[PDB]
Design a protein around this ligand. Sequence first.
Ligand SMILES: C[S@@+](CC[C@H](N)C(=O)[O-])C[C@H]1O[C@@H](n2cnc3c(N)ncnc32)[C@H](O)[C@@H]1O
Ligand SMILES: [Cl-]
Length: 264
Amino acid sequence: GTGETLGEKWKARLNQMSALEFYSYKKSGITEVCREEARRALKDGVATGGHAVSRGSAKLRWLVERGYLQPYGKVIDLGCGRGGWSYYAATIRKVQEVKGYTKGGPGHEEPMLVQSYGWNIVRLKSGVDVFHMAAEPCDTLLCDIGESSSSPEVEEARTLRVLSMVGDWLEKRPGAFCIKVLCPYTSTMMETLERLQRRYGGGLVRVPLSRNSTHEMYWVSGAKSNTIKSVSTTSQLLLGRMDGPRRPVKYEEDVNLGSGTRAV
Ligand SMILES: C[S@@+](CC[C@H](N)C(=O)[O-])C[C@H]1O[C@@H](n2cnc3c(N)ncnc32)[C@H](O)[C@@H]1O
Ligand SMILES: [Cl-]
């Protein structure tokens, strides 16, 4: 083999940054949705204003509007948290049912109950560890699990744990999927992702709403990405942002998910 990858170099540089450098680096040049209004409304109990429950709805919007993902049918959302991906999925015409599962509890996000469009086809279940749930068939499989660590070895071990669990769900044959890959950047991870692409298809995409402090990419059924090239391009973007001036954030309006129930 050839030793340290570009993403491993990125992680080592990230760990050596001072806190002041990290503070400016983490958002340099990223895209960000404005959330102050949504958070205030949600704090006020507004359920019909179209507000997204988290920044996650915008991440899924980015993938869907570009054709990386075409959700349909029964959607299962593993690690749904407050529900940003589940509520976004429920607004999509071809989606018919959304079931989110999340752990909840101290230090973890609980599902939030709002009345964005299609809320009546969404069921969010807390108190569920998806690593100990039997996999079920679905049409679209979503998973946004993976806890960051300063150790790249820990990030790799955590990502392999996520992907092994997701493989049990992929074996039930959904036609669409979107899976967070916390660590795509070690040699073991790139080999694993190539194997997974051969069996299940799809490819990796970097969402520009991700912060520069994580190398996360999304494995989606509609990408046709060379694993090594897509990971390397992302490592180069993240490394390049470690040099030179702070780049401005590209602010965007957050997703508005509307209101009202869906008919059947
Ligand atoms: C990145 S957040 C997901 C955000 C979500 N996609 C959204 O748009 O709001 C990942 C969620 O997975 C949950 N989680 C982590 N491990 C879990 C597990 N083993 N079982 C179920 N949920 C888990 C975390 O508590 C967290 O709320
Ligand atoms: Cl997580």
